[PDB]
Ligand binder design. Structure first.
Ligand code: ADP
Ligand code: MG
Ligand code: MG
Ligand code: ZN
Length: 322
């Protein structure tokens, strides 16, 4: 007899953060480390900034959130802690994903965080992860914490290391599927703000943007956070704009296709000289340079304009590859 296995079990990770991946959410310093003196605690306070940390899951298998979501376990651990897998009692027991909203905060801070992100439930695009709900639950210490509830997206991110860079035609075809989602966001006065390979999921059917945490209104300055090597240089002066999103498209294509120099763990600004890929595909190199121009006024004016030029580049790359 062949066994009946629960396919959810293979989708979940062991709910322990390895010591090499433990950092303070506030100051970024390593925390919870074992030394030649003492063993590293899974929860405590950062010795440098005094912020509380916890690498323990805050939702356990069998927990019911807001009488709707049955927690099954952990999918991954990120900047905002654990990402949980749950089954939605209102939508046929469909597996869904829960993620925290803030690293720390009292009841009022949690309630404010939920309310400010509620508009994401209105974002409707086939290439953007769907947000279903904002729910409250108590953490491992008994204090209420807020969670975003989202669609479970299959596959893996587009993040590629130095040895597995995408062929140019493949990368362009991927971004051509992403650019309409950005055009859709820009059409409703929103900026995605966090485009990078890690935030693009490749499924058996399509590409999907995840991590809507940075999604903000155009020219707002409430959220200026970003990754050195992806974020537009002028974000402090202008706040998120269509121009800053175009810059991230350029950096995303470069990070997927080029062996970009890295310094202190981040990609360096601009594009490397005499790069074999950019010498091979000239129109592609020209498009990337325009997209990452330090002057935002020199970049593609709209995502639709960038898509039009990018389609032209794809035809040229495909012709050259013959
Ligand atoms: N909606 C989702 N569906 C499926 N897996 C998800 C979803 N959101 C996040 N994940 C998983 O968690 C990982 C990190 O997600 P993300 O939101 O980027 O967290 P962080 O920015 O904190 O690292 C993803 O690469 C994916 O494996
Ligand atoms: Mg992310
Ligand atoms: Mg985020
Ligand atoms: Zn700290």
């Amino acid at each position: 007899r062949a066994p009946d296995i629960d396919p959810l079990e293979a989708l979940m990770t062991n709910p322990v953060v390895p010591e090499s991946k433990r950092f303070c959410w506030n100051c970024g310093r390593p925390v919870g480390r074992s030394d030649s003196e003492t063993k590293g605690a899974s929860e405590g306070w950062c010795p440098y900034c005094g912020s509380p940390y916890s690498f323990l899951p805050q939702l356990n298998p069998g927990d019911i959130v807001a009488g709707q979501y049955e927690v099954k376990g952990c999918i991954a651990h990120g900047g905002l802690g654990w990402i949980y897998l749950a089954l939605d009692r209102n939508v046929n027991g469909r597996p869904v994903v829960l993620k925290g909203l803030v690293h720390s905060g009292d009841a009022e801070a949690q309630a404010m965080a939920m309310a400010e992100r509620q508009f994401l439930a209105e974002v409707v695009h086939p290439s953007i992860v769907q947000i279903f709900n904002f729910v409250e639950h108590t953490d491992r210490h008994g204090d209420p914490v807020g969670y975003i509830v989202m669609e479970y997206v299959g596959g893996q991110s587009l993040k590629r290391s130095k040895g597995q860079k995408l062929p140019v035609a493949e990368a362009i075809a991927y971004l051509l599927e992403i650019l309409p989602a950005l055009s859709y966001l820009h059409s409703i006065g929103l900026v995605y703000n966090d485009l990078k390979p890690e935030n693009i999921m490749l499924t058996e059917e399509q590409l999907k943007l995840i991590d809507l945490g940075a999604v903000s209104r155009i020219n707002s300055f409430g959220y200026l956070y970003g990754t050195p090597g992806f974020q537009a240089p002028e974000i402090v002066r202008t706040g998120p704009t269509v121009a800053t999103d175009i810059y991230t498209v350029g950096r995303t294509l470069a990070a997927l296709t080029l062996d970009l120099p890295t310094r202190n763990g981040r990609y360096v600004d601009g594009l490397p000289e005499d790069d074999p890929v950019l010498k091979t595909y000239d129109s592609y190199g020209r498009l990337l340079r325009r997209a990452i121009d330090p002057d935002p006024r020199q970049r593609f004016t709209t995502a639709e304009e960038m898509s039009a030029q990018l389609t032209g580049v794809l035809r040229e790359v495909v012709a050259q590859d013959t």
